[PDB]
Every structure is written in structure tokens, then in C-alpha cells.
């Protein structure tokens, strides 16, 4: 069967950072090969099971999640790390159990002329738990003189663009994250390698 | 080959309005508002104000809310700060500083990166 | 309503001495902090910025760390150029409060 990972690796689309999409694969070999070969992976960080071994265990369920995010912080997608993107808008598990890899994508996203389409969340009333999407729009609410659905002094829109330039530098340019979640469960297991 | 040029102060008296104005020397400045910093003489430094994106957000210091009216012309690539009225507090020294991330619309650059030279605008009579 | 306060407020180091800093601000900030370089007359430019990372062309004896309510700034071999003034300041709520100061002098 040898089921791709180009769906969610080679796609040309990318929900920015919140919309990320969760695609599960089942009854299928992985073989993990392509994911370590590769000499472009600007990051390949793996908790719990070593990188050589993914292939000598068999789960049940594996989660695809992908999206994009600023150059400098890809360090904030890993288990117990707190900052701008895990306590708003995508946390991890403490007690995680896959692996994260991160590519460095400059000539795909960032245009000449400037691009403004990835959205990128930076305001909520709460914190966040893992594993949860939050797509949402309601304007944020400072609390005391909440205003309405109105822009003013204290309610802001909790949306923002990266505005990613050709220039930037190797922070605050575009990369590209993907994390492969493992999961174990009563049903017969069927995602393993050759 | 970034840099800021300020200018616009000096001998200020009271109840006058001078021009406080600095420019940039070459980016896509329309997209990237910027900030007015404010340095004591010898304590330390607070603010002035903030100039958003598309001109659209103007938030001040709230201990001199209502006063200053900071200004953006997009096609000189430059800032103008007013001053509608003076107290003995204003003897400072005005930088204006630019920024790209939290401040406007696509983040670019780290906060506050280059600043850049000053004005000296003590007010006497 | 962000309050800002510099432990320290005053140090004199060894020319080989390392350095330890600290920023300590009021509710929640999360990750956004910045220090600064502040030379007499001059303008004071940036070390690190979000608290974490060194910016291209500071030299890399710098360094910081720090996130919560509480951040930390570390010189590892400060020269007798790296006498100038330092100040930490967050960038995260509306009103963005700016250090106290903090003046550095030599043994």
C-alpha cells in the first residue's frame, strides 16, 4: 500500500497556523524513509521512540498535523515549552509520544512583492489545552468597558499577518512544521513498516 | 543600508508647536508603523507615542493623553509630531524608533531594531 | 498597568566576570521582552530580542533566557566597551511599560 506522506508534505496549501489540518492515516506501511534520508529537514526532533526504530512498532492511529510559523520560534512546538503559539493557539501534550520535523521554505511562500495571506493567532481570553482547534473570529473583550463588536482602545481584532519577506532573515521567515502523532489504542494495531 | 534621520527641536518656547519629524532612509516603509520614545535628561526614558500601520490606530501616553498629535505623511516616507501645549516635564530627548512585529499589519522585524540618532527639545522661557 | 523592576539597579564586575541579570514584570507577559544598549548620546540598538535569541551582529558572548513573570540576561566575558547603561522592556500588552535602568560600572 505504502500510503504517501506527499498529501500533507508536497500539498501546496497550508492552514496557517490555526485551522491546521488533522489528517489521520490507517492500514498502511509508513516505512519512515523519506523522513530520515531526506538531508533538507532543517529540524527533525523525535520524544519517546528513537528515530531508527519508528519502523519496528506497530500502532493504530497516527496523526498528520501540518501548518507554518515563524523561523525563530519553530522551537516552541515541543512538549512542555510555553510562549506565543503553544499557550494560545496549538499545544502539546506534556506526556508526548511523536515526532516533529520543521523545514526551512523561503522561495514557496515568501513573495517578492511581501505576502500577507497566513494568518496567525495572538490574542484569547484563556488559556489553551492540548490538542484542540480554535478557529475563531469574535473580537477580543479587554473585560471592564467590554465596547461591542467594535474596534477601540481596549478591543482588538485577535488576528495578525506575517508579512513574510524575501529579506527577512533566517528568523521571522516562513518554515514549515509537520508532527506526526502516534497513538496506541485497544483496537488491532495496523500502521507499521516493512 | 537601513538608517533614521530625526530632526525638528531645540530652543522650544512655551505654548508653541514645532515640527518634530523624522524620515527613513530605504524600505517598504508604508508597511511598517513606528514609535516616538522619549529619553529625560538624566532619569530614563518612557515614550511619546505610537503610529500604526494604515494610519488608523493613534495610541498615546496615557499621562499625556489628549496632547500630542503624531502624524504620518506615506508619500515623503516621513513622521510629524506636534505639540499643542508644554509643561516643565517636556525637556527630553525625542527618538523614533521602528518597529515590525506587534505593532503592524505582517511581522518583519524584531521590535524596536534601530532607533537611530535623536532631537533635543528643551523647552524654556 | 504593567510595572517594570530591575533587581540589580547597580553593578560593578571583574573585566573577566560573568554577569547575571535579571527583569521582573507584573501579571503576565509571556514572550515578548527586549534589552537594550544604552551608551551615553548614543542610540541604544538591541541585544536580545523575545528574551531568547541574539539578534544578527551582536556578538554572541550575550546571551538571555526567561519567560512567565521572570527573565534572565547573562554576559559571559564583558570588554571595558560593555559599560553602558541596560534596560529591559516588555512589548506584549497596549500600555508597554519600559524598564528602570540599570547602570553598569567596573571594579
Known amino acids: 500500500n505504502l500510503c504517501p506522506f506527499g498529501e500533507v508534505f508536497n500539498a501546496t496549501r497550508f492552514a496557517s497556523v490555526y485551522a491546521w489540518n488533522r489528517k489521520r492515516i490507517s492500514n498502511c506501511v509508513a516505512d519512515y524513509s523519506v523522513l530520515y534520508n531526506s538531508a533538507s529537514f532543517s529540524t527533525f526532533k523525535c520524544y519517546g521512540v528513537s528515530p531508527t526504530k519508528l519502523n519496528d512498532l506497530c500502532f493504530t492511529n497516527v496523526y498528520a498535523d501540518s501548518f507554518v510559523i515563524r523561523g525563530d520560534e519553530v522551537r516552541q512546538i515541543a512538549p512542555g515549552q510555553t510562549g506565543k503559539i503553544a499557550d494560545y493557539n496549538y499545544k502539546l501534550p506534556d506526556d508526548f509520544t511523536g515526532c516533529v520535523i520543521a523545514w526551512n521554505s523561503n522561495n514557496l511562500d515568501s513573495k517578492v512583492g511581501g505576502n500577507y495571506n497566513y494568518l496567525y493567532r495572538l490574542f484569547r481570553k484563556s488559556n489553551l489545552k492540548p490538542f484542540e482547534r480554535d478557529i475563531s473570529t469574535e473580537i477580543y473583550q479587554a473585560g471592564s468597558t467590554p465596547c461591542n463588536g467594535v474596534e477601540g482602545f481596549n478591543c482588538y481584532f485577535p488576528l495578525q499577518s506575517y508579512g513574510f519577506q524575501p529579506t527577512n532573515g533566517v528568523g521571522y521567515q516562513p518554515y514549515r512544521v509537520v508532527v506526526l502523532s502516534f497513538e496506541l489504542l485497544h483496537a488491532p494495531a495496523t500502521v507499521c513498516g516493512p | 543600508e537601513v538608517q533614521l534621520v530625526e530632526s525638528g527641536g531645540g530652543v522650544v518656547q512655551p505654548g508653541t508647536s514645532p515640527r518634530l519629524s523624522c524620515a527613513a532612509s530605504?524600505?517598504?516603509?508604508?508597511?511598517?508603523?513606528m514609535h516616538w520614545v522619549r529619553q529625560a535628561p538624566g532619569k530614563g526614558l518612557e515614550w511619546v507615542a505610537v503610529?500604526?500601520?494604515?494610519?488608523?490606530?493613534?495610541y498615546y501616553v496615557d499621562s499625556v493623553k489628549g496632547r500630542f498629535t503624531i502624524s504620518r505623511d506615506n508619500s515623503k516616507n516621513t513622521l510629524y509630531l506636534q505639540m499643542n501645549s508644554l509643561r516643565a516635564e517636556d525637556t527630553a530627548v525625542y527618538y523614533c524608533?521602528?518597529?515590525?512585529?506587534?505593532?503592524?499589519?505582517?511581522?518583519?522585524?524584531?521590535?524596536?531594531?534601530?532607533w537611530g540618532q535623536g532631537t533635543l527639545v528643551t523647552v524654556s522661557s | 498597568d504593567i510595572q517594570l523592576t530591575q533587581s540589580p539597579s547597580s553593578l560593578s564586575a571583574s573585566v573577566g566576570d560573568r554577569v547575571t541579570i535579571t527583569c521582573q514584570a507584573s501579571?503576565?507577559?509571556?514572550?515578548?521582552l527586549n534589552w537594550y544598549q544604552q551608551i551615553p548620546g548614543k542610540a541604544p540598538k538591541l541585544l536580545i530580542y523575545d528574551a531568547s535569541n541574539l539578534e544578527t551582529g551582536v556578538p554572541s558572548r550575550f546571551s538571555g533566557s526567561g519567560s512567565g513573570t521572570d527573565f534572565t540576561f547573562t554576559i559571559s566575558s564583558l570588554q571595558p566597551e560593555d559599560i553602558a547603561t541596560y534596560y529591559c522592556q516588555q512589548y506584549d500588552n497596549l500600555p508597554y511599560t519600559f524598564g528602570q535602568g540599570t547602570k553598569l560600572e567596573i571594579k
Open positions: 524608533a521602528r518597529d515590525g512585529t506587534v505593532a503592524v499589519r505582517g511581522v518583519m522585524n524584531p521590535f524596536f531594531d534601530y
Open positions: 530605504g524600505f517598504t516603509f508604508s508597511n511598517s508603523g
Open positions: 501579571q503576565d507577559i509571556s514572550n515578548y
Open positions: 503610529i500604526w500601520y494604515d494610519g488608523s490606530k493613534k
